[PDB]
Amino acid sequence: MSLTDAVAHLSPERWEEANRLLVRKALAEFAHERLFTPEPADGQDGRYVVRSDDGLTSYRFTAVRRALDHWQVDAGSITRTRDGAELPLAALDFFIELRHTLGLSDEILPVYLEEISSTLSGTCYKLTKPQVTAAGLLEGGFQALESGMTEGHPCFVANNGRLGFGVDEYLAYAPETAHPVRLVWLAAHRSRAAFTAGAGIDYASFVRQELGEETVERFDGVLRGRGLDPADYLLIPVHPWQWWNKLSVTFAAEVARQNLVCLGESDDEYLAQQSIRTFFNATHPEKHYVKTALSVLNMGFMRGLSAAYMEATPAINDWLDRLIDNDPVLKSTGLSIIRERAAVGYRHLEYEAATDRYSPYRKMLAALWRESPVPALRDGESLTTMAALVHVDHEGRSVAGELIARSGLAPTAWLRHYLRAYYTPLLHSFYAYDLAFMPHGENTILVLKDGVVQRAVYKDIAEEIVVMDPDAVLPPEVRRVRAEVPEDMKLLSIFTDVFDCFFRFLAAGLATEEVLAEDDFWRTVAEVTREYQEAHPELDDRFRQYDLFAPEFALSCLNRLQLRDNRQMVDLADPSAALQLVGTLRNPLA
Amino acid sequence: MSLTDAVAHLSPERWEEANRLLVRKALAEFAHERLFTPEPADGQDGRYVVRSDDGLTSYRFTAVRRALDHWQVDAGSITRTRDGAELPLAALDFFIELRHTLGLSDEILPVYLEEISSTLSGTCYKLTKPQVTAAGLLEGGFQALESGMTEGHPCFVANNGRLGFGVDEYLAYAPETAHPVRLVWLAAHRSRAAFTAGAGIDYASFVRQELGEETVERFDGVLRGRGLDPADYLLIPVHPWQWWNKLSVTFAAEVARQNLVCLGESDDEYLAQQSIRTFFNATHPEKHYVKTALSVLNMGFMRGLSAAYMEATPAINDWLDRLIDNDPVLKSTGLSIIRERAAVGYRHLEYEAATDRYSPYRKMLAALWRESPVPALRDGESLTTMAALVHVDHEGRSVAGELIARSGLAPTAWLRHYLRAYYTPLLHSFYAYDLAFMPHGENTILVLKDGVVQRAVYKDIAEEIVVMDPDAVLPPEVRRVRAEVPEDMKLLSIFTDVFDCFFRFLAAGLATEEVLAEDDFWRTVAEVTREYQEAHPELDDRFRQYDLFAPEFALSCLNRLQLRDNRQMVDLADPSAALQLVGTLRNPLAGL
Numbered sequence A: 001m002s003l004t005d006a007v008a009h010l011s012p013e014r015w016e017e018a019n020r021l022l023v024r025k026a027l028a029e030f031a032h033e034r035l036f037t038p039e040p041a042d043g044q045d046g047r048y049v050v051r052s053d054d055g056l057t058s059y060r061f062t063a064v065r066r067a068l069d070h071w072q073v074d075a076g077s078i079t080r081t082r083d084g085a086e087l088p089l090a091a092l093d094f095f096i097e098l099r100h101t102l103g104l105s106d107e108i109l110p111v112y113l114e115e116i117s118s119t120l121s122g123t124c125y126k127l128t129k130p131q132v133t134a135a136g137l138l139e140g141g142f143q144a145l146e147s148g149m150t151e152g153h154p155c156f157v158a159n160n161g162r163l164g165f166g167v168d169e170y171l172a173y174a175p176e177t178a179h180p181v182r183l184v185w186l187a188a189h190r191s192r193a194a195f196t197a198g199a200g201i202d203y204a205s206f207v208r209q210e211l212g213e214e215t216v217e218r219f220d221g222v223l224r225g226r227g228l229d230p231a232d233y234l235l236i237p238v239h240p241w242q243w244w245n246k247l248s249v250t251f252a253a254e255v256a257r258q259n260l261v262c263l264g265e266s267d268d269e270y271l272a273q274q275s276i277r278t279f280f281n282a283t284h285p286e287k288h289y290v291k292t293a294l295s296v297l298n299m300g301f302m303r304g305l306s307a308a309y310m311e312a313t314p315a316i317n318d319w320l321d322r323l324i325d326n327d328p329v330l331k332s333t334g335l336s337i338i339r340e341r342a343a344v345g346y347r348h349l350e351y352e353a354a355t356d357r358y359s360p361y362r363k364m365l366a367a368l369w370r371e372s373p374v375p376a377l378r379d380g381e382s383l384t385t386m387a388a389l390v391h392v393d394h395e396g397r398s399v400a401g402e403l404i405a406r407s408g409l410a411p412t413a414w415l416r417h418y419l420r421a422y423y424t425p426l427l428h429s430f431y432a433y434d435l436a437f438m439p440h441g442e443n444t445i446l447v448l449k450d451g452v453v454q455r456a457v458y459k460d461i462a463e464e465i466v467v468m469d470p471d472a473v474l475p476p477e478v479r480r481v482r483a484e485v486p487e488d489m490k491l492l493s494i495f496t497d498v499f500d501c502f503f504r505f506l507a508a509g510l511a512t513e514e515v516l517a518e519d520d521f522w523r524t525v526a527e528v529t530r531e532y533q534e535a536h537p538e539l540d541d542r543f544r545q546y547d548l549f550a551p552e553f554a555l556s557c558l559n560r561l562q563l564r565d566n567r568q569m570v571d572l573a574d575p576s577a578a579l580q581l582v583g584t585l586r587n588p589l590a
Numbered sequence B: 001m002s003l004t005d006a007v008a009h010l011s012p013e014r015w016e017e018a019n020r021l022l023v024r025k026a027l028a029e030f031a032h033e034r035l036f037t038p039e040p041a042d043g044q045d046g047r048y049v050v051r052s053d054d055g056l057t058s059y060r061f062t063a064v065r066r067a068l069d070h071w072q073v074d075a076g077s078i079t080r081t082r083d084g085a086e087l088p089l090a091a092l093d094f095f096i097e098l099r100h101t102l103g104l105s106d107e108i109l110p111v112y113l114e115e116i117s118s119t120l121s122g123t124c125y126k127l128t129k130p131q132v133t134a135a136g137l138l139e140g141g142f143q144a145l146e147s148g149m150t151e152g153h154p155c156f157v158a159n160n161g162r163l164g165f166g167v168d169e170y171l172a173y174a175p176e177t178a179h180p181v182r183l184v185w186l187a188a189h190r191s192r193a194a195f196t197a198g199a200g201i202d203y204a205s206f207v208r209q210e211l212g213e214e215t216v217e218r219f220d221g222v223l224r225g226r227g228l229d230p231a232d233y234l235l236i237p238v239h240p241w242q243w244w245n246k247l248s249v250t251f252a253a254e255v256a257r258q259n260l261v262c263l264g265e266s267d268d269e270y271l272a273q274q275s276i277r278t279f280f281n282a283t284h285p286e287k288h289y290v291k292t293a294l295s296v297l298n299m300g301f302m303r304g305l306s307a308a309y310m311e312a313t314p315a316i317n318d319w320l321d322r323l324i325d326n327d328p329v330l331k332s333t334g335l336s337i338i339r340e341r342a343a344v345g346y347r348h349l350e351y352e353a354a355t356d357r358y359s360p361y362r363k364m365l366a367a368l369w370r371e372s373p374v375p376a377l378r379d380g381e382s383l384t385t386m387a388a389l390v391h392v393d394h395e396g397r398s399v400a401g402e403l404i405a406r407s408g409l410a411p412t413a414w415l416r417h418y419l420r421a422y423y424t425p426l427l428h429s430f431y432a433y434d435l436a437f438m439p440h441g442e443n444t445i446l447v448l449k450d451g452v453v454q455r456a457v458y459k460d461i462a463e464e465i466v467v468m469d470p471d472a473v474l475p476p477e478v479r480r481v482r483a484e485v486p487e488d489m490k491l492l493s494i495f496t497d498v499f500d501c502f503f504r505f506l507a508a509g510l511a512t513e514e515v516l517a518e519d520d521f522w523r524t525v526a527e528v529t530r531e532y533q534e535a536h537p538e539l540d541d542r543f544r545q546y547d548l549f550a551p552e553f554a555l556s557c558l559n560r561l562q563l564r565d566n567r568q569m570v571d572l573a574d575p576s577a578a579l580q581l582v583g584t585l586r587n588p589l590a591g592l
Ligand SMILES: Nc1ncnc2c1ncn2[C@@H]1O[C@H](COP(=O)(O)O)[C@@H](O)[C@H]1O
Pocket: A151, A152, A153, A154, A159, A160, A274, A275, A276, A298, A299, A387, A438, A440, A441, A442, A443, A460, A464
């Protein structure tokens, strides 16, 4: 693949830039989580300083403080000083010099640095991409936006590690390189593998729509060639990294015994979405997304897919589809989900016998399909990940910025359209149904027309939603998602997932962009809040129980999670135990 | 290369055979280590049984017991029984069924299972290779022997893991595939890298012999193009797997600040030896071997290479070579080491500060060069890995067998020449110099003329030697090899690494081959031992104190070490405390 081209993106110039960007983000987000407390340096108003563990090295910087204990740290401003000499900005030396101040044990530190190095390299890659503007992105379309994204999750410092990719694999498989990928297809023996269909899915028809009859006959022929009966098998699509580095070695027994048969590559070409392991069908965008098991470490979790949980997945999706059709409060917000319509799972009996339930060895071979948001589009409508709204091009324009311009409306009017599609349905789900999501940039998609947010689309459902009412009534396979979550924390699904981690940045980007000041931003949030509350007094009891207008709420720290344990940020059985709450934040709705 | 082809070697017929062969080695070796005690079954003379943790699954097999508690399990005899029903033989099921009998923690068990799945695939691959007789391998030559070996270390059941290679990488880099590999060359800034030169070596001339002036100047070209002065840099060959999967990500910082520069591939074609990480120059067999840092898991160790230790490596080889030259007792044996002549290491400052002395992060980027044993050959001579002596072809003939035949010597006559070349220096080293090796079939090379062993060649020197005398008198570059060892255990480099881990197998093989009786084999070892001791009465005190003839010696278990910790079987600051001695073995040298 050419040894030297592979590492061409790693030049001194781009590494210096990438390092400055990442340190500025480590200052902003670690001050926000109070891991350090910058002190006003010398006698300057906006100048602050942060010192190393020993206090001999000083990171001086200027910054602009904003709502929700935000720190707009100016990348250009940062310096590193020790014994009266400048030193170079180095993200690694940074985490090492602050290792006791941050939560970094001798056991976690070296791997964290791998994740830092890995993220920095991806910034070096993105810096070699042709610069595109906010206008250029929207002109490109849905996938130009997906791959155009550069930040990632805006809270996590080490957010694009992808530990397990070699540099060639990085270039092949990272979403931000937009290189086509062809899926590897397996035949899996039904003594180990299970196809779980959603409402109205037939297997023999599903795979023929999703591969074409000609490919289906060919796969069945590969089986017949080996003396095997296609009726004993089902199909599983696997990520090529999984098949070459993991399945073909760890599952060698299954392949050799013909519990698994390697069939070939897919004729359609897929592109990795921001979540890496999920694939949009580029050849045929009408067709399904494909989510895949990928035993690689990104942002606090390994990204294997539990075959156990695949059994429950299409049912949970079916039920929230039925829920949203049958509730005209939500139908009024155009809110929909792209249902995880089908799944497959391989149960490896030997590794089950050898592991516990929460073992990565059980999440190595599983896949789900997901509806496409495309054929649902009416004339004039477009797609975009909502993580675009906090993307700032090389000119200082946000996609939000360009969308507000292009719509022509007053900023607060455009915004009102956005939260009526995106934010309001969350409110109604919590209050009227006890239903929370994980609705950040990656998990949300917005329909656009004429520059204005027509409706929202949600995804990553079964894995992520919680129903916070152990006693509430549900169908059987849905009852998994219930949980006893502390009362004081029940509202963090809005406070931290929506305000501290998205609006905090959106409001603050539009403020520096001089498009909408923070006060006018948050006032609009309150006004669509009351607009929903007053329209439904039959829940005023819960309205007061869970007061979204309280003068303070808990500061839940996200990085602090990953510094504590960056292979499993939270136990999945008790997700509430691992949270780290360090003080409070002035609610901007006061 | 093709998807369906890369796993073509995994067929049901070969998987079954692989599992049978690996279960029989499990029975034999775990029996030897007294992890379980098979009891005679159904009154039939050779029949034995071993039961699972819960008692329900029974493995029944016939076996010939031999010296040193050896168990010759017949693989065709093994049957799996549960509820009075025959089950298929499956190494993975086996190790689960006995997870508590063996020392297999919930944490280690799945990783071991991978190492097992991986050893089984390698066997499956090797079963696709064209069958080749002992005679065929001999006629093929030095690398036909290396790439033709199949067992690997005979003691360790999980010996051929190569945990890190994906299937395509296995096909490219595994010794048994013999596919040619081009090393990746990198420029390292002298601020972090250091070239350590053995006696009579000079960096400038050494790189031009090994790469060619035309290529060295091409590399300086690349450096100057980027603005870099070649005097500020030195060269490091890296295993391609380590470049693509480790250094380019884990060391991205260094590549992009230009502390490392990726120069490119080598013009010569290299062949992986049995260490996986050491390469023989196939284009130019005169040129040095290259040992690379390979951050992959195999038989109980990360096969990384410690940069700090390259600084002493050639000094230690230099010292040993002088020691052998200036001692006629060793010189009369023909013994040579192939010296590790030069080494480079890279000190990653940041990762050092984030880790401790013994850490895989400090072992990701280094290389040593090793002398090729080839030019030293005189007319009629040929090389083989000592590992070939216990290799058995598809006809039941061992390369030992074929050599003995071709030689036309009485077996004991043949065995005596091998022993004088191989076993005698180990005695003299221990008794005159308190010195020990790791002299198994991979760390040892035999020179052959007319089917007979002329001389032995040792290798893997600096990492492995030890001078069991903390007060001993060495040059300062070499003192790091001294060590306090218990009074007993000192002899275990012979007792365990030679007798129990190699001779046990070579004896039993020639016995089942009706070439040489067991009792004859050990009588010959005793004679060679006495041929030495009688020749040196000035050392009788040490002969009694370290009695090679005592009626028993300790049964140092090896598979137990790997079952307890398969990442690091022995700490390198205290390698004796890991040893698991479980009772004793009747010493075959006692009555003789
Ligand atoms: N802008 C973004 N917001 C949130 N997650 C992102 C973003 N870009 C990439 N991701 C990745 O998408 C995945 C989200 O997983 P989950 O937390 O289950 O949605 C993680 O691997 C994230 O690092």
